[PDB]
Amino acid sequence: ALRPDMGYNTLANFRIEKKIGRGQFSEVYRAACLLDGVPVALKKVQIFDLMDAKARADCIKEIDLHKQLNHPNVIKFYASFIEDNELNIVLELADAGDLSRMIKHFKKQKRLIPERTVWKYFVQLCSALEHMHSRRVMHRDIKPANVFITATGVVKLGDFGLGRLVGTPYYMSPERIHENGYNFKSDIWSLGCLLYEMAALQSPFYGDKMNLYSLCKKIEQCDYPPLPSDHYSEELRQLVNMCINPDPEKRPDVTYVYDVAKRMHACTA
Ligand SMILES: CN(C)CCCNS(=O)(=O)c1cccc(Nc2nc(OCC3CCCCC3)c3[nH]cnc3n2)c1
């Protein structure tokens, strides 16, 4: 029935209000904690089935890491447990939904995001990434569907990746296109595509045809529809070209990107 002793460690202490969305391989529900009333958001990873013992251990190792990060622009982490053969991850609830919901809303009404608000948000999530990279931690999953906004307007980064019937991680990168491996400069790439979707409300390499080889060819040569010159500063447009660079060596460190956003956030007050 109820068990305060465990605290946030058993699903018996929450009331599932509604299902807010379905993740990559997970379903996230809104909930209320009965013990103290705080609103929390559950994550059903569905690792019970179709997963080996090592992959489960790996999934935990990521959770143990994500719990160590404490930052204003990273979603708070409350509890992770296995109950009834289902890994539930209860995280802080952000009123304004995932960033993709904001993009899909704006796109629905055919109005672009002002440049002054792009920097307002972009600087926040850059702060989170500089925090991680400075501690030798790569996010490995930066997409609009995993960026969250509070009613106040603050932006938060989210959970780590669950990659552990063809699938596309929203922002596929060249290092991973070939058998090279995810690295730090590969997180910038995702960050670059994110800045582009805020401005254009559509992924840069989103195409009319979903062919993997067709899309792969469009990533080798950085060919993508440029942004409206009038509405978005050259400072921004060049920062996108800078991050969406095939060769990882040419991309910038998260700091330089972080410094540009700060400077540009002040300019567009
Ligand atoms: C839609 N309404 C009628 C019903 C709910 C009334 N609004 S609401 O309660 O404040 C509301 C609605 C939607 C989102 C959010 N914010 C939120 N959503 C998450 O789910 C992530 C999931 C996985 C990726 C993409 C799909 C969503 C979070 N996960 C961690 N933190 C999260 N914060 C809040």
Author numbering: 21 to 184, 196 to 300
Lines quoted from the article behind this entry:
The NIMA-related kinases (Neks) are a family of Ser/Thr protein kinases, first discovered in Aspergillus nidulans that are conserved in eukaryotes. Nek7 is 1 of 11 Neks found in humans, and contributes to the assembly of a robust mitotic spindle apparatus. Human Nek7 is a 34.5 kDa protein, comprising a singular canonical kinase domain made up of a small, 5 β-stranded, N-terminal lobe linked to a larger, mostly α-helical C-terminal lobe. The intervening cleft between the two lobes forms the ATP-binding pocket and active site in which phosphoryl transfer takes place.
Therefore, in an attempt to artificially induce a stacked configuration of the R-spine, we mutated Nek7Y97F to introduce two additional aromatic residues (L86H and L180F) to mimic the R-spine of Plk1. We expressed and purified the Nek7 strong R-spine mutant protein (Nek7SRSL86H Y97F L180F) and demonstrated that it is catalytically active and retains a similar ATP Km and Vmax to that of Nek7WT. We were unable to obtain crystals of Nek7SRS in the presence of ADP/MgCl2, but co-crystallisation screens with Nek7SRS and compound 51 were successful. Superposition of Nek7SRS bound to compound 51 with PKA in a prototypical active conformation demonstrates that Nek7SRS mutant bound to compound 51 is more similar to the active conformation of a typical kinase than previous structures of Nek7WT or Nek7Y97F. However, the conformation of Nek7SRS does not exhibit other hallmarks of the kinase active conformation: the DFG motif is not ‘in’, the Lys–Glu salt-bridge (K63/E82) is broken and the activation loop is mostly disordered. The crystal structure of Nek7SRS revealed a configuration of the R-spine in which residues 97 and 86 are shifted laterally compared with previous structures of Nek7WT, and are positioned above H159 and F180. However, this is not a correctly assembled R-spine as the side chain of F180 is not in perfect alignment with the other R-spine residues, but is packed against the C-helix. While the monoclinic structures of Nek7WT have two distinct conformations of Y97, all three chains that were fully modelled in the monoclinic structure of Nek7SRS.51 have the same conformation of Y97. This happens despite the different crystal packing interfaces experienced by chain A versus B and C. Therefore, we conclude the partially stacked configuration of the R-spine in the Nek7SRS.51 structure is due to the presence of the mutations, not the compound or crystal packing. As with previous structures of Nek2 bound to purine-based inhibitors, compound 51 forms three H-bonds with the hinge region of Nek2. This is also the case for compound 51 and the hinge region of Nek7SRS, via the main chain O of Glu112, the main chain N-H and O of Ala114.
